Paper text:
To dissect the molecular basis of CLOCK-BMAL1 binding throughout the nucleosome, we determined cryo-electron microscopy (cryo-EM) structures of CLOCK-BMAL1 bound to a solvent-exposed motif at SHL+5.8 (CLOCK-BMAL1-NCPSHL+5.8) with an overall resolution of 3.6 Å, and at a histone-facing E-box at SHL−6.2 (CLOCK-BMAL1-NCPSHL−6.2) at 3.8 Å. In the CLOCK-BMAL1-NCPSHL+5.8 structure, the nucleosomal DNA is distorted to accommodate CLOCK-BMAL1, consistent with the E-box not being fully accessible to the bHLH DNA-binding fold. The CLOCK-BMAL1 bHLH fold is oriented perpendicular to the plane of the nucleosomal disc. It binds the solvent-facing E-box by separating the DNA from histones H3 and H2A over around 17 bp from SHL+7.5 to SHL+5.5. Cross-linking mass spectrometry (XL-MS) confirmed the assignment with the N-terminal basic helix of the CLOCK bHLH domain sandwiched between histone H2A loop 2 (L2) and the DNA duplex. In addition to the bHLH–H2A interaction, we observe a more prominent TF–histone interface (around 300 Å2) between the PAS domains of CLOCK and histones H2B, H3 and H4, made possible by the flexible linkers between the PAS-AB and bHLH domains. The CLOCK PAS domains bind to the H2B C-terminal helix and the junction between the H3 α1 helix and its L1 loop (designated H3α1 L1 elbow). The CLOCK PAS-B HI loop is adjacent to the H3α1 L1 elbow (Lys79 and Thr80) and is immersed in interactions with the histone core, implying that histone engagement by CLOCK-BMAL1 spatially competes with CRY binding. CLOCK-BMAL1 binding at SHL+5.8 is therefore incompatible with chromatin binders that engulf nucleosomes but compatible with single acidic patch binders that bind nucleosomes along with CLOCK-BMAL1. CLOCK-BMAL1 at the histone-facing E-box (SHL−6.2) differs from the solvent-facing E-box (SHL+5.8) in the extent of DNA release and the detailed histone contacts.
Numbering used by the authors:
A (entry chain N): 80 to 129, 150 to 218, 245 to 263, 282 to 296, 316 to 447
B (entry chain M): 30 to 91, 107 to 223, 248 to 384
C (entry chain F), D (entry chain B): 22 to 101
E (entry chain D): 33 to 124
F (entry chain H): 31 to 124
G (entry chain E), H (entry chain A): 40 to 133
I (entry chain C), J (entry chain G): 15 to 118
The structure:
Amino acid sequence: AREAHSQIEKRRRDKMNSFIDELASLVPTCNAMSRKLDKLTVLRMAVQHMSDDELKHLILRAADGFLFVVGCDRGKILFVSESVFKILNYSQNDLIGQSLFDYLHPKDIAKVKEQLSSSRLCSGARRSFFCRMKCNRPRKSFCTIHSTGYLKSNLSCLVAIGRLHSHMVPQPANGEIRVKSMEYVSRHAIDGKFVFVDQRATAILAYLPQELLGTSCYEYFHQDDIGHLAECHRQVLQTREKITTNCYKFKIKDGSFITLRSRWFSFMNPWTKEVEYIVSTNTVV
Amino acid sequence: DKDKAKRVSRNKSEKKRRDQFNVLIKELGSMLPGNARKMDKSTVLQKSIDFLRKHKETTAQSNEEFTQLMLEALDGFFLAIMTDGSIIYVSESVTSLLEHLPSDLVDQSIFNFIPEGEHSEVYKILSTHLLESDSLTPEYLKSKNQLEFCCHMLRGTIDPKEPSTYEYVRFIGNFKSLTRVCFVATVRLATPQFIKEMCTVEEPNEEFTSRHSLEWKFLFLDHRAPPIIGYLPFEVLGTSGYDYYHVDDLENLAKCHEHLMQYGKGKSCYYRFLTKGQQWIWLQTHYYITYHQWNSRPEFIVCTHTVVSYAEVRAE
Amino acid sequence: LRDNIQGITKPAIRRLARRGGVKRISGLIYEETRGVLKVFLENVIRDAVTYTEHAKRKTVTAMDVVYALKRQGRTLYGFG
Amino acid sequence: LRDNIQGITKPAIRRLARRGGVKRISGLIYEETRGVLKVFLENVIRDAVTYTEHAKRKTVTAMDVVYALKRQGRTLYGFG
Amino acid sequence: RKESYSIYVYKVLKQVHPDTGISSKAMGIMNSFVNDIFERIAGEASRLAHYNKRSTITSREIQTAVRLLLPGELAKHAVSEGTKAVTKYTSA
Amino acid sequence: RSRKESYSIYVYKVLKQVHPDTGISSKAMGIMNSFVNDIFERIAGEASRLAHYNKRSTITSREIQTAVRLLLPGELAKHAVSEGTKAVTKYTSA
Amino acid sequence: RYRPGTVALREIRRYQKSTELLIRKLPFQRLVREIAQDFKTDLRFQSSAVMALQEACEAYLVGLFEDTNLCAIHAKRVTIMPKDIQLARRIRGE
Amino acid sequence: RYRPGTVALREIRRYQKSTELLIRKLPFQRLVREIAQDFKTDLRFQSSAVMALQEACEAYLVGLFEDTNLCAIHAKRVTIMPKDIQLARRIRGE
Amino acid sequence: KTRSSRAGLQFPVGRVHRLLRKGNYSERVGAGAPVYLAAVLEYLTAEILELAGNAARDNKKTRIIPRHLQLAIRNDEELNKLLGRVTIAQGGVLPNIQAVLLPK
Amino acid sequence: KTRSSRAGLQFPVGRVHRLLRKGNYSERVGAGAPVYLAAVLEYLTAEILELAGNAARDNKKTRIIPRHLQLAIRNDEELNKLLGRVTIAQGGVLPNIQAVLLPK
DNA sequence: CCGCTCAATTGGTCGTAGACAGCTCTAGCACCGCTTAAACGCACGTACGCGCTGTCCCCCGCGTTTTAACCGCCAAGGGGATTACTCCCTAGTCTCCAGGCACGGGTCACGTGCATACATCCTG
DNA sequence: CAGGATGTATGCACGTGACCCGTGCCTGGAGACTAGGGAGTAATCCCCTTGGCGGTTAAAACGCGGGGGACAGCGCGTACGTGCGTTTAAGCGGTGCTAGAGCTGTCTACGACCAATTGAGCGG
């Protein structure tokens, strides 16, 4: 019985050796080598030895804005796509090897430093922010760029696409088809101060998130609509029920007004039975 | 002092060699197709032998991170349909943009989602275009196969009572023959989506833990949350848990928490959480309450958060 | 309340030590003894209370003290 | 069987004492240790045998040793 | 209703010391003693039956428990007493 | 042939969820089996007495929780009680 | 006056002969409640429970003192030190 | 020559590090039979039973030795005496 | 006829039998089991009472008190081993003083 | 489906239930009791194995041996309280050396 | 001592836990031959245990003063103990099938032996 | 710098020791269902603990004196530790035999259970 066992071990050794030599035969370097390579070396060389282009065109033709890569340690631009010349009018040679902070607006640089900070691309590494970037051809010295991307590992960097969205809304919905309008979410203190605002608001309101937070919605509401909106505000504080406003004008960064309609409610935290904030969903008319 | 560890140095060295071999076996096996556990080393090498044969042949006869990034920035998805309108493939990103599962689109007619007044445009685009390729030039490179057109598409929904709602999208793509002729395009929403819902979890299962005060403020956040929610513990501590919840889900969660206040234990409804990366992620949470021994009254809430798929949310 | 451990007076400790056959006591003993007694009481009380809580009672009975001592390896006779 | 207690050698005792962290041993310890061991071992055996007798068996099992140790507050893991 | 051994303890005391009475405090001690020994034997007998896969308790388990639980001199007497009691009981 | 129950399956699985890169010796496994039955008896015994002391005829999570609070050190008891609470909650809810 | 140690031997004989509690009852009751309040407030206590605790506590401390006395004697000391108590406690399993 | 006590330290470290039985197994097995014959002659033993006894015995003695060592140290001594063993056994109520 | 009487015992066989059936000690209890046990309980009880009665007499008392039970149990080495972990309410302690404490 | 699966437990709730229903611990066993206990057993098991796995790696081992279980138990104050009187086959000891013995 | 149960005991019926007879193989008991690490006995050196002197300061004994403890009384009412009804929880029953377990075959980790080449070193 | 000789380390093959997968498979877990006893609950009571009021008093707090005990320092010698050679019996690896452990099947005497009777035990 012991003899059978021992020869089974021989069979195992023989089978392994047979496969190691066979594995070696598939590696050009191992096959070219005259000498009988050791088992460790064969395996090392074997692991070294171990459509997408169609998709590349499919996605690139649909591409918009520009890709850029910026280092987290210094804000240095490591790469940018040629399409950036359409948007910022700077060339690849003007941006690469220079700090992104040299092109960002001073108020947005602080936000980018925070965005670049760490916390198949995973959502945890995901970053998305609006910022103002300098243009080679000029307030018009800057344009508002939406930057969305993920943090990537020697120098850590953000890989993101910068997109220059139109402040105008192209192709209005047809009356025949029920089409979802543009929307943004914001939340307000009891006195109407922004305590939260999203990027959709910035695309719609032109104001970047830091330009809205800590200010009253009444600073942007048109006085013709404030009387109505103020009534909705006074009422919404009294109820959990959603109150929908009429269409109203809201001031945007470029100094113009746009027409919005919004649904408001006062959210109560059941643990304290207290209103945390006014919650608003705004809709573009 | 007395000489020692001579035997240990030799035994360690012999063992070190065995460890090096074991590392290479693991590495070699890891790259294989048809990966399985409990394979013997002989099987690992045999599959590695066959893999190298297949790898050399397939590469001789022949972008992910970029493609994901560009699709998200564009607020778009790949969509491929037959001339007959039947959908053959769609990128998962469509679920975040139009709330459609791949299972809702694939094998279905595209005209089920296009408004009836726009059917003729897409039927014309599919039916008018015909091309036979030569043996030298790939179809995608031919300007004849490249096409750009726009149409509306119906959105999916969790609650079917919601009135039919559509999105205007642009198709940028090319015609390709399959072993019939399909059209494949990146579909971009004309209306930008600066915030979207994560509908599929990148891992089969993931979880994170937190503790909350009797005001529902964060008392604790574990090391597992930040990879999921993007926030480090100090970024959430002292803030209300509600600050991260979706506008519609705030009310349903309040009801769930009221139930928890009543029984001290339970499970939440499905809800969305706003990540630092500005994505809404669908979650479901298990809760229990811990009590102050002196009087057996509540002191804090312990929360176990499970990330869930859009399909799981809509299923119940 | 508080500070009732000091209610275990030096003489009270002397008497106990004498029953134990102790002829002479250092001053450091008295504080040490109080510490030990406090722990002992905490152990018995914690268990006696635990029994009381399980029974959903608010009054601690001698039987709970007995059950606490029994599980601790100490058996006391004459209290039911 | 006699004098098998001598089977517990002085070196064996030294080594056990070393495992107990003992640096230095008086000569009287070796016999004292044998005496104490004899008693401890006897107490366990008497119980193990008693279990065996109750079981109406002629062979003592490890389980009887475990039970004998268990009731004596010498719970042992690894033998079931 | 509550039960005690005070009747039986008293009767036993009069067998050994007819001239002697018992205090209520001492009686409390004796009742605790009887219940404690009952628990010790009943517990040991239960474990013995368990270890031998027996569902029934017999005099063998108790005798064994007595031999295990009691000191040598007490065990010898207690066993003879139990043996006599069962023998007499069976005969009567 | 006869069959004997063991916890070896479950002890193994638990380790694989904690330290997947490690295994268990046969002696260590025998020790863990000895440990599980010991603790089981301690809890089941304590729970039995608690039912007796309160003239109850049924063992519930309350007896076990109490036995756990009595038997374990406070740190382990807190965790063990929470785990027992969660397991029952999840089970009864499904 | 008597030379020190003579009175102690008289006291030892007296207290060993005695059975009554050597510790003051009311201070003890306050101490019990002071401790018990930490596990649960608004507790009530039977007078029998208090006596049970006092009897158990004195028996415990006296037993500890006996072992403590032996330790001091073993060290060829008459006066007992905290270190004698700590050793006895450690050996006893505390 | 190694100075007195340097060997003992190496031995302590070595024996504490190891897990092997220190008592010679056959002598032990005979000792078990030598005692067991007093309760019942013509008695047989499982080999595992003998090892179980030995492991319990060595563990017991080691525990006793550690307490004994503390007693000698408490006395400001290094050498352990039978007196130190007897004290430890008395304190543990053996 | 009373089972206790058949066994020649003072202790109640019926109560013991019931107590063995209670407590969940077993699924079944042998008829001779409570008889054997009652004899043991009675025997041990008698040993303590007899010794305690002597202690009472030594103290010139005609009634047993916990002090007497304590002395009897602690003086008898077999009972001391059996009940060495037991505490007796108002038992006091044995009058033991170490010789090293005595004057010389 | 197994109750253990329904409770998210690894331990055999069905086995635990049988073991609680047997052994005469009570006349009846609550349906939730086995689940609660299985969770406790699993928790304690995990705590020991977690420490043991560290002990193995701290010594460059990939295999848990009795020594690791002993070391884990004696180093962990709570486990040593629970298992302080327990002896382990080939358990070994903590490397306790008194300062008076050490060179200085 | 007096009154009144219903706990204790009788005498059945019933199902089965254990005793009993029997067989099957396991592990222990008994013994030998050979290897050599542990065990024994002896020689030599000194660190450690022990006894002793001599400070020096800590505790014990005693008195006197002051404080809370015991003892006794009281009332307030809360909580444990009790009895009465509902119903729902799990033991008990029957059934089905797959998860955990044992046995066989096969595989991996280990030291240990050996071949072999390279490090190195002695002298020309 | 060369060649022959010696040792370190690399590399492999070797079988044993430890280990796991597969196949079988059946036992025991889970599911469905019911019966009726246990537990939960409401409604009640009234015994015991809480709490205070007041006085008497021993017990506790505090202060001082001075002898006794704890302790440090010093010296003595010897019982112990350390090293060595010699020996032996413990380990190890066998062989050889079967008493006893352990499981299988039969059948009984046994205790559980219930209806009936009665007189030892409990309240006052």
